[PDB]
Design a protein around this ligand. Structure first.
Ligand code: NAG
Ligand code: NAG
Lengths: 49, 49
């Protein structure tokens, strides 16, 4: 960043890079908890798996 | 011995542009409203020649 900036945004308009106010080191942000759970059932008549 | 001459008027040329946030932006284009210098405007030109 510039030596007066603290946060950084992208075209998403979201803050994705912050500056450590103890080291002056740029640190990226990466969310988690992505996606869902799908289940593959072969049929209820047959063995349960 | 203070001699006074009528003041003249000069024109702006794509100047008076500055940074309005500590938010880093890169490879992006966006618009914002704030008090800026109007381009190609007459401003007062002073001398001390
Ligand atoms: C399950 O399989 C058995 C044996 O083939 C059959 O008799 C029964 O009708 C089947 N049930 C269903 C609903 O698929
Ligand atoms: C600025 O003002 C002067 C004097 O009125 C005039 O001669 C000149 O054309 C003006 N220029 C602009 C940019 O309007």
């Amino acid at each position: 960043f510039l030596p007066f900036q603290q946060f950084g945004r992208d075209i998403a308009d979201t803050t994705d890079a912050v500056r450590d106010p103890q080291t002056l080191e740029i640190l990226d942000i990466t969310p988690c908890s992505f996606g869902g759970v799908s289940v593959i059932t072969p049929g209820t008549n047959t063995s349960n798996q | 011995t203070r001699t006074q001459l009528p003041p003249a008027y000069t024109n702006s040329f794509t100047r008076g542009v500055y940074y309005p946030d500590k938010v880093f932006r890169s490879s992006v284009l966006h618009s914002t409203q704030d008090l800026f210098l109007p381009f190609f405007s007459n401003v007062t030109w002073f001398h001390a020649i």
